RNA sequence: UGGAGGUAAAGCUACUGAAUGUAUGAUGGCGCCGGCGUACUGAAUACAAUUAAACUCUGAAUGCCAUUUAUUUUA
RNA sequence: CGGUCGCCUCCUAAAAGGUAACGGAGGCGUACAAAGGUACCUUCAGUACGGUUGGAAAUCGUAUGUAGAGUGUAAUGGUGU
RNA sequence: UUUGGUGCCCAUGUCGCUGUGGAAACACCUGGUUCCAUUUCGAACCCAGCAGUUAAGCACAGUGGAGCCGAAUGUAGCUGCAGUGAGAAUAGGAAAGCACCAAGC
């Protein structure tokens, strides 16, 4: 998959976020972005998912960048086991998506191409696709 | 006495001969340092005593050893152990000792093809490195065990390695 | 790059400042300068960045040995009765004619 | 539990004076330092006394 | 049914010596009194404060407790005993 | 403070470097055949 | 009103750490002949934007203690 | 029972601080007769240059950066004569 | 006030450069010539003087450049749902300023 080389710290809380979106309201270098209408935990399957239909339906003289990379980590408990000691288990490596980032920013192909690429990766995503312009 | 020579006549001249917008920016010299780095002292080449001894016969100060830059492995050394000897050279023994360095010293430098080395720092100073510890009178081949020279250093207060390169070329040193 | 007169300055506004919080009710502060031909004294009092009486070649008694150059400050001090003051031993060493200087004070007045 | 504290007693009257702070590591022998007594009233080279 | 749980980490909040603003400004402070309290010397006693074996902050004489910054950057703080009458 | 060293004089047998300096306290009059115009280079 | 926070928040080339094209691109993959740029490892900055309770260059309101006019009650 | 029984470093814990948790981050059961005091002196580590071994670091002489060195600790901040 | 002492606010004022005044004072310099000191000695430290100097030490104008600070609105925060108002960005700023003593006055 898509994994980071390391977390700041192995079993960070579920923390509450109120407020509103911090650091990328758009894309870095690319012309468009898959951005979210919100902002949550996500793990690096869907990223894979998305970015490789995307790349799919694409063509190939465009360039490809992921902006919020995985950086911290998820804690996640199994389950039919009874509620105590404690938070879960350290798992598969988090997103944190805010309310306007961008996880997929995508240039030089056409256009129209773009926004088919992310409404299909919004179909393997677990989040309502946005289409964003370019920014930087 | 080379002193009173050098900065009557020869100061004055390079003063007049590059001049500035006084006489004082004349290239100046602080001190200087001879020095003896033996660090195998600690892993038993003769503890200590040949840096200190030889130093301190070509010595004008009171042989004071400095402590290291740093801790390393590859010869055992922390939170001190001096290593080598170290020497500040003032007042008279400046001159003292530059008299031999460029009377008698000079001739018997092995590699003496002109001494421009471009051991200046850009920083106003002039690094002479010799690896011939037996480079004056002053000292017998029989101190220590590896080759083994000094890494002696002139020092300008105004940092200009130019003024050091014209200290050099006056005192009957080749270039 | 140093010229062996900042390296004096700096070492003496360090002690003139540590002696000045020693005695939490300060006096007025006795600064003084070896120059190279005389020895300057100054009242700098630290409560308005002002000073109260100087001696030197120019200001009382002609160039210093001559343990009058810190007397007259010293005279100069208890005609303002300030005495006890917070002295500051000197970037320059405490040794030479300021050695009587210094004392100078204490045998004119200045109790410290 | 266990003490790094030292008890030391006036070499004059053999009396309990001083309960302080000892390097037991360093200085593992018995600590001789000339503090105040007050069965005297001065200050003398008091010595451990337990 | 319950045999046995998951254990707990050593991960509960440490609580130290109460400390904080325990003087404010406006009011007048007595000697003895503690006026701050900190672990480590990172606030600055200014004048007539006294630093005791604790890193504890208490005014050696009296007058009013007083916080200020100054410094390259306003970031230093000092708090001061400045000499307000008794 | 480093033990005295007194007056030394020189005397050289290729070119009669004569001259005069306080240095170390085990010679008085260095004389060598190699000091001053001895060396190849030493010219200049 | 005073004090300071460091919560929220922008930002993290302002740091702690992951992160990306772009800049030198050393340096090692890879060959080359002490010589050489590298299919790639590729430092950190210039530049580019990031992620975050245990990150804070900054950075509030609120809150907090003091402050003075002040009101309740015989507590 | 798992785990626990004394104490401290960060935060969730909502800005003085605090802040609950079967909440996630580390440990301690001490260390200096100097690491106390007085006084005087005294600094960055690093990095760089050029240099006897000495190589990247020792080594000298500097420049350099001005706190990322150090300061007893676990972590925190703090500390520029 | 020219110029010597340095407090005091900070990165605007931190740095860099163009330079300027030094005539007395000042700094280097003359030397280790004693007092004094070097964790090592004339490098300080001490002496007792300035042949010299504006370069540096000192001070004085500019260099808005590196760099600082970063305005208003809005923006999150905030939390009667708008203000409240960050940050951050821009404008612009600042090349220091705040004084005494002392001689050149």
Partial sequence: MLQPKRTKYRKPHNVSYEGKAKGNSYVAFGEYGLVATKGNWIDARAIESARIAISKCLGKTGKMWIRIFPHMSKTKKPLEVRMGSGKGNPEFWVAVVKQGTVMFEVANIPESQMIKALTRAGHKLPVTWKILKREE | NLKAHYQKTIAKELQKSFAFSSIMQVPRLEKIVINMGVGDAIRDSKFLESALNELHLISGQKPVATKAKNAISTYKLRAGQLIGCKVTLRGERMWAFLEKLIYVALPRVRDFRGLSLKSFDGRGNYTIGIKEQIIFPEIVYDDIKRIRGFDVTLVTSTNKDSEALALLRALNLPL | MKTRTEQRRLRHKRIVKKIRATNHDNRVVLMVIKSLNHISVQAWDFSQNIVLASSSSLALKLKNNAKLVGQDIADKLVKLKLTNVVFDTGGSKYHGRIAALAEAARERGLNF | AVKRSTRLGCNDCREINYLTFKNVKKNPEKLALNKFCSRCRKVVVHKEVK | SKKGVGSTKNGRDSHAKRLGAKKADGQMIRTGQIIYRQRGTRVYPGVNVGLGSDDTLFALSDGLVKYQKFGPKQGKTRVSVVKHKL | ?44
């Fill in chain 6, 1 to 44: 403070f480093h033990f005295p060293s007194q007056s030394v004089s020189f005397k050289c047998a290729s070119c009669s470097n004569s001259f005069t300096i306080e240095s170390t306290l085990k010679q008085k009059e260095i004389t060598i055949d190699i000091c001053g115009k001895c060396h190849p280079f030493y010219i200049g």
